[PDB]
Design a binder for this molecule. Structure first.
Ligand code: MG
Ligand code: MG
Ligand code: MG
Ligand code: MG
Ligand code: MG
Ligand code: MG
Ligand code: MG
Ligand code: MG
Ligand code: MG
Ligand code: MG
Ligand code: MG
Ligand code: MG
Ligand code: MG
Ligand code: MG
Lengths: 201, 132, 76, 305, 23
RNA sequence: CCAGUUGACACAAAAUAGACUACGAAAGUGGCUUUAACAUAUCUGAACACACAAUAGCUAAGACCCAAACUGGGAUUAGAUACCCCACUAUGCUUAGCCCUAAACCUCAACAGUUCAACAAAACUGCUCGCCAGAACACUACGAGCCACAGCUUAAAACUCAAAGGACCUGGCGGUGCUUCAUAUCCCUCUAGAGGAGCCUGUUCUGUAAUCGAUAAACCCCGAUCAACCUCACCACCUCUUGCUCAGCCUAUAUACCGCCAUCUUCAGCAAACCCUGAUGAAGGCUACAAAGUAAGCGCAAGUACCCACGUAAAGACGUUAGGUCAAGGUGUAGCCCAUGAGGUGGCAAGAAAUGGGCUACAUUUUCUACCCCAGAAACGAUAGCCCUUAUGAAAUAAGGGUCGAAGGUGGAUUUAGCA
């Protein structure tokens, strides 16, 4: 890896960059900084979770096209949501969200799993042992599930942005294939439970 | 490993020279270039004929002295000057040295249409690199 | 007697070089090859203090008498 | 040992001849003559830095070792001669004597450095014991003379990496507080002219940023620095981008704008930006294409398996 | 030593027992 | 009759104390009451006799829920009288007709005493009987004794040989328990080309007048930065022992080389010259409240240059496959000396069969178009081959124009690099 050990990984947001203080300042000064990429931005509006989602959605190893398509689909979903909300009631800003960031947060909450089946072994035979996972790992798993569902390579009709918008609208409120896969995984994990007595760690 | 021109450790007081002890990845690092000829240049062309002439001259000079050329020469082309730096060893008497040197110089100057001249390596110590 | 349960190895080195060695041997020692074993206590501090004082005085007087007598003899 | 003196005398004669070569009057020349020589009549060209022509008086290059270890009928230079490395043990005994004297009264170097200082090849545990003794001495009644004698074997702190090279506001050239800068991203360079006033648009390569990069990521990258500093609109630029393509040029412009901002910004925000990561150049640069591999780092398939 | 000199003895004894039981 | 509080039927079995010390020539033993219990105390003196049984077994049987020899039925099962689950028949507790063999070892006999071949149950002499000084044959045929009729005490002689047996030295090994641990290198996690398939491409090898190099480990876009007579270095017809060579060999001995280089290395050290540890033998040189290393020489380290100093081209020690090669090229030695060389003339390019290394698609990503990102078809992939050819030639190789316009809907547990 080219990332030399002399350098370090800084932050990206400017939440705390709005000014123990001297100690933290000296610690940050005693660091060789690199440079942020094109996708990662300091815009407080641009939530970093959508940035990580777009990074995971890197199709063909190109982040430009993936980010453009993701932003277009988010804009389309936001337009549909505001047409369903604005062109309806007066100011009911509590029953429907107000931004695509909140839409993606709700989609993650509805798709973020909680159990991770694992084939743990003890010598030469696997064993069904639910292994825990932190928030980052669960979010990455949900993102990978969304990716492999949106690009299942079996539709052969609809378009990429239309498919993504439809699947997002589905995952919005308990619908779509991602939540079905999550429920199937939960069922498979809860099937055989009395087997977690064979974990080495 | 790679023994392109090196010699791994063996004894301690064995014979070995500079050219007889170097790695392939040190051709220009720890080792120099024994042929600063006007061939392999860039963007200048003309390399095949220059290398052929250099090899011919080196082989001829090695064949001249019998049993006195351990390493190759170091040809130098200063335009119309052929300077030779042979690793010659003190053989016998200076009369034969001068006779052979003059004969070879005249022959090469009349053949190659360019002045040629050499100089012996009167040193009581070789260019030993590794003690081996 | 060093810190470990074992006498000093210098006795064997001395025996391997023809050297008459002296030693403040004790019960835990092994006067096998020592040419001049000196049994005595090694735990009390005053004992070692007296040992070292006697050694200093003896060697100093020996060197002084050496210098004096050798000078007086070479003067002959 | 005689060969050392022989070579020293030979090199002294050589240096005498070299000094006699030049017809000038300065005999105690400095490194200027050696540099001129290496530049003219000694251009080796070897990539290495050791086999190069570095002829110098061996009076200081040739290392020294323990001279004589005995005199009139033996008699070394200390009573710890048979212990090997008598100097180190004598210094340790002196340190212990000073410790006992102080008791009656009431950064560090590397092993190779200590070996070079002395003439003994000490190990690591002996050095640890020496450090322990020095620490015990420093702790036993903090004074001044002993503290300095112990620090003699130590170095200062010399703190670095603190302040930022604050660039001037630059008021010359024209009547605007502009500031030059640059940016790198996969082989790329630029020179921006970010002004201080002008709450409006920005001229990217002489043309607005609407027909140049309609993508929103480019505008977000361009806003990165101004958004971090909160000085958004109040800024006009007439940069001249070159090299790269898309994301490379975007990152170059971002770095140039960040530098132009940090040029005339309070030290607090300057340090915050420097530590956030938007001034230096990340290691992500056009690497060397591996010749022994198909692409970059992707090695052959069934190489080890 | 170990139980090594008795292996051949047991082999011979087992061969004899098998020869007896056979015929 | 499975879990039992109010109770129940064996010749069983000694829960902690058993951590205790004994006798018996030795077997032999431990929860309890009683009969009788420890011979000579100078030793030895039958393997031609009086007796025990270690554990087991034949015969007459009693006999303990509790165990197995005979056991059935089933993981695994390629082939299991054992292994993983139920108990049971001679026998474990008892009286007699009996071989008394063992690891009846504490492999070290009883008394008088005194102070190391190696493994070590320390060393030195007297006393008594027993033992042997070729193994496999030889805990056996045969002979002598036994109520055994599968055996016991002894138990030999032939063909083979250099024997044979025991111990010792640091190593490879640890599906050895464990210590440092493996960072894409390993499982848990994934980013992704390739697996079903189109195109360039050869592998096991076929064919004549068209060799090919271990053409596994390190070959299968390797040498080939590529096979129309050159390139193919491979053979025949006009002629030779001057064959263009004062001949060569691309012919061969990898059990003899020079030559380049991955591999373990993503380690960690090798040793000259010295001085020590084994009653100096195969070997070793061993840890700071310090128990023998200085260690010629080769090393990481110092990076050799750069995107600095990580990371890249390549290691990184004595070495690892008589490593690839007698033919990438030359070469000891043998053969051709009516050639396997050839002076001039004639000869391939296809995969019978499987496969993989690179460019490609299964989806709106195959076409990106005037705009590289403000505007979208077939609803599929819409090949190769062939013809006109950029080039030329006695047989096309990268590809431009026309035609075909396919092969199959990520297809097998997945495979390899990746900590940017
Ligand atoms: Mg007896
Ligand atoms: Mg008797
Ligand atoms: Mg019995
Ligand atoms: Mg039973
Ligand atoms: Mg029974
Ligand atoms: Mg009983
Ligand atoms: Mg018996
Ligand atoms: Mg027994
Ligand atoms: Mg081979
Ligand atoms: Mg290698
Ligand atoms: Mg290095
Ligand atoms: Mg490299
Ligand atoms: Mg070989
Ligand atoms: Mg021929």
């Amino acid at each position: 890896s080219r990332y030399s050990p002399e350098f370090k990984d800084p932050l990206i947001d400017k939440e705390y960059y709005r000014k123990e203080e001297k100690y933290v300042r000296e610690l940050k000064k005693t660091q060789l900084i690199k440079a942020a990429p094109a996708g990662k931005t300091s815009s407080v509006f641009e939530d970093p979770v959508i940035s990580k989602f777009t990074n995971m959605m890197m199709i063909g190893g190109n982040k430009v096209l993936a980010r453009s398509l993701m932003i277009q689909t988010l804009e389309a979903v936001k337009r549909k949501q505001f047409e369903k909300y604005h062109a309806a009631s007066a100011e009911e800003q509590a029953t429907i969200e107000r931004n695509p960031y909140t839409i993606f947060h709700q989609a993650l909450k509805n798709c973020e799993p909680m159990i991770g089946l694992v084939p743990i072994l003890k010598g030469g035979r696997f064993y069904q042992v639910p292994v825990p996972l932190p928030d980052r790992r669960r979010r990455f798993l949900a993102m990978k599930w969304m990716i492999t569902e949106c690009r299942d390579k079996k539709h052969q009709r609809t378009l990429m942005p239309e498919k993504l918008s439809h699947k997002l609208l589905e995952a919005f409120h308990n619908q779509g294939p991602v939540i079905k896969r999550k429920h199937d995984l939960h069922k498979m994990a809860e099937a055989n439970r009395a087997l977690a007595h064979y974990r080495w760690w | 490993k790679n023994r392109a021109a090196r010699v791994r450790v063996s004894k301690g007081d064995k014979p070995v020279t500079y050219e007889e002890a170097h790695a392939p990845h040190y051709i220009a690092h720890r080792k120099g270039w024994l042929s600063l000829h006007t061939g392999n240049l860039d963007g200048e062309d003309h390399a095949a004929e220059r290398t052929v002439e250099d090899v011919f001259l080196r082989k001829f000079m090695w064949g001249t002295f019998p049993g006195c050329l351990a390493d190759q020469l170091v040809l130098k082309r200063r335009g119309n000057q052929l300077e030779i730096c042979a690793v010659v060893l003190r053989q016998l008497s200076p009369h034969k040295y001068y006779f052979l040197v003059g004969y070879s110089e005249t022959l090469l100057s009349y053949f190659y249409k360019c002045p040629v001249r050499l100089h012996l390596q009167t040193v009581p110590s070789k260019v030993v690199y590794k003690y081996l | 007697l060093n810190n470990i349960f074992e006498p000093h190895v210098a006795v064997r080195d001395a025996a391997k070089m023809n050297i008459p060695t002296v030693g403040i041997v004790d019960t835990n020692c092994n006067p096998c090859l020592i040419t001049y074993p000196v049994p005595g206590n090694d735990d009390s501090p005053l004992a070692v203090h007296l040992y070292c004082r006697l050694f200093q005085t003896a060697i100093t007087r020996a060197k002084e008498k050496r210098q004096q007598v050798e000078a007086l003899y070479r003067l002959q | 040992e005689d060969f050392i003196k022989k070579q020293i005398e030979e090199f002294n004669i050589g240096k005498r001849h070299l000094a006699n070569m030049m017809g000038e009057d300065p005999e105690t020349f400095t490194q200027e003559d050696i540099d001129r020589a290496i530049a003219y009549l000694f251009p080796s060209g070897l990539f290495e830095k050791r086999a190069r022509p570095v002829m110098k008086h061996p009076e200081q290059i040739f290392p020294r070792q323990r001279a004589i270890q005995w005199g009139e009928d033996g008699r070394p230079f200390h009573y710890l001669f048979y212990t090997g490395k008598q100097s180190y043990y004598s210094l340790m005994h002196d340190v212990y004597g000073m410790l006992l004297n102080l008791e009656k009264h009431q950064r560090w170097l590397i092993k190779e450095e200590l070996e070079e200082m002395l003439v003994e090849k000490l190990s690591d545990l002996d050095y640890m014991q020496f450090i322990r003794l020095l620490e015990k001495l420093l702790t036993s009644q903090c004074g001044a003379a002993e503290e300095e004698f112990v620090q003699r074997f130590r170095r200062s702190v010399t703190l670095e990496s603190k302040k930022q090279l604050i660039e001037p506001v630059q008021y010359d050239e024209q009547g605007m507080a502009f500031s030059k800068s640059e940016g790198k991203r996969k082989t790329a360079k630029a020179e921006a002219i970010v002004y201080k006033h002008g709450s409006g648009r920005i001229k990217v390569n002489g043309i607005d940023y609407q027909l140049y990069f309609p993508i929103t990521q480019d505008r977000e990258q361009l806003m990165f620095p101004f958004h971090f500093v909160d000085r958004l609109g109040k800024h006009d630029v007439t940069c001249t981008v070159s090299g790269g393509g898309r994301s490379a040029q975007a990152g170059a412009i971002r770095l140039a704008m960040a530098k132009a901002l940090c040029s005339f910004v309070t030290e607090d925000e300057v340090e915050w930006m420097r530590q956030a990561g938007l001034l230096t150049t990340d290691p992500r640069v056009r690497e060397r294409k591996k010749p022994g591999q198909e692409g970059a780092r992707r090695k052959f398939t069934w190489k080890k398996r | 030593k170990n139980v090594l000199k008795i292996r051949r003895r047991k082999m011979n004894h087992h061969k004899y027992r098998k020869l007896v039981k056979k015929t």
